[PDB]
Amino acid sequence: HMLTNLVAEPFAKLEQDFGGSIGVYAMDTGSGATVSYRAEERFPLCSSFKGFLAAAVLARSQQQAGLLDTPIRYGKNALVPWSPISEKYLTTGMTVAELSAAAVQYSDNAAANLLLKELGGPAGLTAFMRSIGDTTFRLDRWELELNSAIPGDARDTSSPRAVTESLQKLTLGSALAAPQRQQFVDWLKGNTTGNHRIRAAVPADWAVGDKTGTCGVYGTANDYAVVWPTGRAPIVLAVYTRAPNKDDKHSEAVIAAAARLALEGLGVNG
Numbered sequence: 001h002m003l004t005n006l007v008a009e010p011f012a013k014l015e016q017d018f019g020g021s022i023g024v025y026a027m028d029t030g031s032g033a034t035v036s037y038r039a040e041e042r043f044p045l046c047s048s049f050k051g052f053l054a055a056a057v058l059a060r061s062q063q064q065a066g067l068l069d070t071p072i073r074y075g076k077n078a079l080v081p082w083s084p085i086s087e088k089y090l091t092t093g094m095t096v097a098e099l100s101a102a103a104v105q106y107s108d109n110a111a112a113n114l115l116l117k118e119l120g121g122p123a124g125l126t127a128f129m130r131s132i133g134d135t136t137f138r139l140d141r142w143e144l145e146l147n148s149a150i151p152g153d154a155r156d157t158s159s160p161r162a163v164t165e166s167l168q169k170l171t172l173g174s175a176l177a178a179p180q181r182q183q184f185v186d187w188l189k190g191n192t193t194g195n196h197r198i199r200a201a202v203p204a205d206w207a208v209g210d211k212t213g214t215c216g217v218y219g220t221a222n223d224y225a226v227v228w229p230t231g232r233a234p235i236v237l238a239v240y241t242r243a244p245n246k247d248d249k250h251s252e253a254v255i256a257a258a259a260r261l262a263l264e265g266l267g268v269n270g
């Protein structure tokens with residue numbers, strides 16, 4: 001508690017201008033200081049579960065040395081909306097590693113559903129998260145049904161705090177073996193969908209990896225990231241939003257602004 005919110009930041013005004021709720025958790029891994037706002041509330045994961053999905057695949061690959069190289073062929077019926085990479089390889093197949101990279105870096109939905117099947121579905125991903133000590137995360141449904149983002153519905157949600165804690169364990173801690181940890185980091189670093197979210201608050205000369213989520217309803221969107229400022233320890237953070245009305249729009253700018261406030265609250269000069 002002593003190191004949480006040492007410096008207050010105007011998150012309430014930000015979410016009021018947005019017309020909804022913002023949840024933020026950010027950890028300075030050097031000192032343990034944190035910024036926390038609505039950090040234990042549940043928010044829909046949307047596509048942000050796909051980062052943890054890829055980590056779960058990497059964990060399994062530690063016991064199955066041939067897994068990442070395995071070629072997966074799929075039918076047209078696997079190609080749900082927003083499958084920008086897997087649609088280009090329908091007639092050829094893709095490897096497990098390629099599906100994982102597409103799920104992370106392009107938010108590819110067909111790839112995500114194929115990998116979910118490999119792990120035993122939403123309960124299998126949930127079990128992986130339990131295995132690293134995350135008792136908050138729950139995945140319940142598949143793409144695209146998991147994006148419904150219904151107010152008060154705990155299905156397919158986590159908290160900003162649990163997201164950050166699990167991200168730290170997987171990218172900086174010991175939840176993955178070292179080679180798989182760096183592969184997870186590299187996939188996050190190569191994400192293409194997050195340039196207007198946490199990355200927009202991060203100076204260009206710092207390294208960063210992230211995974212976004214966008215549900216398309218209820219003003220519900222999010223991003224989580226690991227950030228390596230030069231000359232100090234990495235920062236892990238999560239920013240989640242939601243809003244009361246089904247047709248409320250999400251805002252990338254609000255996510256970037258919340259990330260800026262989190263870095264300011266940690267005393268990280270940007």
Ligand SMILES: *[B@@-]1(O)O[C@H](C#N)c2ccccc21
Nearest residue numbers: 046047082107147213214215
């Ligand atoms: B997920 O939130 O990231 C993609 C985007 N934007 C996407 C598309 C369609 C459904 C879910 C998701």
